[PDB]
A paper describes a structure:
In the complex structure of SMN-compound 1, compound 1 binds to the aromatic cage formed by W102, Y109, Y127 and Y130, which otherwise accommodates dimethylarginine of its physiological ligands. W102 and Y130 sandwich compound 1 rings. In addition, compound 1 forms a hydrogen bond between its imino group and the side chain of N132. This hydrogen bond boosts the ligand binding ability of SMN, because mutating N132 to alanine significantly reduced its binding affinity. In addition, the W102A and Y130A mutants of SMN did not bind to compound 1. On the other hand, the mutations of the SMN cage residues Y109 and Y127 weakened, but did not abrogate the binding of SMN to compound 1. Hence, the sandwich stacking interactions of compound 1 by W102 and Y130 of SMN play a more critical role in the specific compound 1 recognition by SMN. Due to the electronic similarity between the N-methyl and 4-imino sites on the 4-iminopyridine core, we did not expect to resolve the orientation of compound 1 based on electron density alone, and could not exclude the possibility that the imino group would instead protrude into the solvent. However, the positive binding results of 1-substituted pyridine cores to SMN presented here could confirm that N132 does interact with the imino group and substituents on the pyridine nitrogen would point away from the Tudor domain, as larger 1-substituents would otherwise clash inside the aromatic cage. Although the binding affinity of SMN and compound 1 is not high, SMN binds to compound 1 60–180-fold more tightly than its physiological ligands such as symmetric dimethylarginine or R1810me2s-POLR2A (Kd of 2.6 μM for compound 1 vs 476 μM for symmetric dimethylarginine or 175 μM for R1810me2s-POLR2A9).
Survival of motor neuron (SMN) functions in diverse biological pathways via recognition of symmetric dimethylarginine (Rme2s) on proteins by its Tudor domain, and deficiency of SMN leads to spinal muscular atrophy. Here we report a potent and selective antagonist with a 4-iminopyridine scaffold targeting the Tudor domain of SMN. In order to understand the structural basis of compound 1 recognition by these reader proteins, we determined the crystal structures of compound 1 in complex with SMN, TDRD3 and UHRF1, respectively. In this study, we identified some low micromolar antagonists with a 4-iminopyridine scaffold targeting the Tudor domain of SMN, and compound 1 shows >4-fold selectivity over other tested methyllysine or methylarginine binding domains.
Numbering used by the authors: 90 to 147
Amino acid sequence: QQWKVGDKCSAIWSEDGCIYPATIASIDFKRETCVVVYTGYGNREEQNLSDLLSPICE
Ligand SMILES: Cn1c2c(c(=N)c3c1CCC3)CCC2
């Protein structure tokens, strides 16, 4: 997938290694990272772009 800022996705939370819904807050194209915000949980963390999942994965 080609992701954009604001996209809904699912990501693997670094704390528990499980998949959750999130929104892309920003993308660093040089570093190939992004920051996601976990829906309903308020927190954010960086992900590798390559690691994001379809927003249907939950
Ligand atoms: C399940 N969970 C998740 C996140 C949390 N901050 C917290 C929980 C549990 C409490 C904090 C991020 C994505 C999933």
